[PDB]
């Protein structure tokens, strides 16, 4: 053989798939916003990109551990924000409730309870009457009622000074690691792709949590994309990413009042009541023409996958808990559950009634519940529907699904992969001591 010797090279541009901890980074720009108070060292506005001319890397969004990290990080931040501030154990008392009917529309007739109760401020065996309105969904009958979660969990008051308003977060690689991404249009989210480039920090993603509809986040480059782990398997969710937003306007058109109740030595409970003006049902408007056009685009792409000679329809989801069956978001600080039966009703403005809850069992666990204090004044917000989470049941039927928080991030993190740099190797050559 040719008398070539082993030559060792350090600084070799090679890598392997790896799982590590990525760090939070943000803008230089919100004083009590948990995403901003999480420091998240400001990113460098200048992307590196470094196009890799002949790199064809293999991706699999359904196995992306970046999604798992984001899920874990969100939960951890959320939980630590609830360590301080008021615990509401003292509210697990008998309530005496009436139906709140002195200024209502009829569709709201069964929604509010008056609920008077005995609570104290001193260990003086001196209780005082306190009343607060509650939404029906938070109160369960034992005239005598109790809060819904006092039977199974601790109730913690969300601290009113703390905001969870989503701020786009960029994930950045630790030293020794790099993030690679696909730039291809019409990419599956899986399999190989050319035109791979490098990332120090990902684009910022807002940690928006929702059910059924994907809000804000980002849009597809040209056409609505349909992605799934196992497309012929009806046990999987289909993530549909729109190439244009559908604008949705939501509101809570009730001028409310926050009532501060002393609950302990330096502790306050936020009660609600004495709503000013007419009491009306919360709702979302969804532009109608846009929605219909958007479905037409989705249907065309579903046909490419399921046959251009069949007929599909959209049904009003399925049964189960509100956390599953309704659309969920929390703009303005209050939690909304909306009926999407008005959207997923077709075979190939739309007002969606909404309900509001104050006692929230965050999806991620049981044994604890969060109490959302009431918001003073009224709530209005506008958002972009950017996608859908669908399941499928000749013809075929599709239904809104999801509910797994990770689907809302997986749909954004389908372009990025984490690799470890291993800059050491050998090759035969002409190089003799």
């Amino acid at each position: 053989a040719e008398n070539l010797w082993v030559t060792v090279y350090y600084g070799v541009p090679v890598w392997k798939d790896a799982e590590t901890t990525l760090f939070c980074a943000s803008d230089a720009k919100k004083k009590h916003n948990v995403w901003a108070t999480h420091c998240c060292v400001p990113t460098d506005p200048n992307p590196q990109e470094i196009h890799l001319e002949n790199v064809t890397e293999e991706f699999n969004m359904w196995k992306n551990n970046m999604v798992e990290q984001m899920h874990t990080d969100i939960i951890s931040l959320w939980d630590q924000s609830l360590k301080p501030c008021v615990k509401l154990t003292p509210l697990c008392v008998t309530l005496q409730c009436t139906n709140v009917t002195n200024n209502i529309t009829d569709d709201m007739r069964g929604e509010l309870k008056n609920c008077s109760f005995n609570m104290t401020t001193e260990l003086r065996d001196k209780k005082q009457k306190v009343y607060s309105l509650f939404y029906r969904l938070d109160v369960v009958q034992i005239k005598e009622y109790r809060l819904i979660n006092c039977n199974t969990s601790a109730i913690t008051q969300a601290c009113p000074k703390v905001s969870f308003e989503p701020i786009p977060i960029h994930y950045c690689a630790p030293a020794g690691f790099a993030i690679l991404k696909c730039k291809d249009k019409k990419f599956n989210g899986t399999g190989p792709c050319p035109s791979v480039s490098t990332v120090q920090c990902t684009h910022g993603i807002k940690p928006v949590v929702s059910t059924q509809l994907l809000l804000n986040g980002s849009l597809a480059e040209e056409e609505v994309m349909i992605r799934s782990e196992n497309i012929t398997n009806n046990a999987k969710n289909i993530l549909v990413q729109f190439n244009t937003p559908v604008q949705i306007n939501c509101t809570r058109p009730n001028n409310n009042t926050r009532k501060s109740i002393r609950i302990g030595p330096g502790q306050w409970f936020y009660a609600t009541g004495d709503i000013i003006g007419d009491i009306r049902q919360a709702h979302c408007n969804v532009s109608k023409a846009t929605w219909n056009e958007t479905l037409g685009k989705v249907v065309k792409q579903l046909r490419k996958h399921f046959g251009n000679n069949t007929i599909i329809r959209f049904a009003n989801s399925s049964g189960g808990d509100l956390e599953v069956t309704t659309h969920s978001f929390n703009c303005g600080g209050e939690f909304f559950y909306c009926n999407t039966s008005g959207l997923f009703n077709s075979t190939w403005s739309i007002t969606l009634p909404c309900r509001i809850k104050q006692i929230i069992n965050m999806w991620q666990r049981i044994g604890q519940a969060m109490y959302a204090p009431p918001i003073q004044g009224v709530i209005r917000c506008v958002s972009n529907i950017t996608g859908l989470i669908l399941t499928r049941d000749t013809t075929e039927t599709f239904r809104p699904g999801g509910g797994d928080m990770r689907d809302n991030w997986r749909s954004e993190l389908y372009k990025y992969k984490v690799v470890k740099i291993e800059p050491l190797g050998v090759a035969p050559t002409r190089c003799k001591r």
């Binding site: 600084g11 470094i50 090759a427």
Partner: protein
């Protein structure tokens, strides 16, 4: 330009070695996680440096040896290796030949140091 050479051939890529070699070093739960990440980066760095030390390649991005290529590792022509392969492709080509080479490099350096002492001893 950290991985800018990734698509380059081996004989072209090995000019940017400084960049790849250089950009390795760059109070509750996150506090401990960040420290774990920092400690690890240091440990990985030191392991690579220790091997270069052991093999007699300390202080160099490229170092010569006295251990011959053993053919079964790869039978490709050197012109094929240096001009028609990237380092990533190459690493895959010989991904199964690791300690089989490293142990030889360690043995060689130890013998060389003994020989040097015996000469300086004279």
């Amino acid at each position: 330009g950290f991985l800018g050479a990734a698509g380059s051939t081996m004989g072209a890529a090995s000019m940017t070695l400084t960049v790849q070699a250089r950009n390795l070093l760059s109070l509750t739960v996150w506090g401990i996680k960040q420290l774990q990440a920092r400690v690890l980066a240091v440990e990985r760095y030191l392991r690579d440096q220790q091997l270069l030390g052991i093999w007699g390649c300390s202080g160099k991005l490229i170092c010569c040896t006295n251990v011959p290529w053993n053919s079964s590792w790869s039978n490709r022509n050197l012109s094929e290796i240096w001009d028609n392969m990237t380092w990533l492709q190459w690493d895959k080509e010989i991904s199964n030949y690791t300690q089989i080479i490293y142990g030889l490099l360690e043995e060689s350096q130890n013998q060389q140091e003994k020989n040097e002492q015996d000469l300086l001893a004279l």
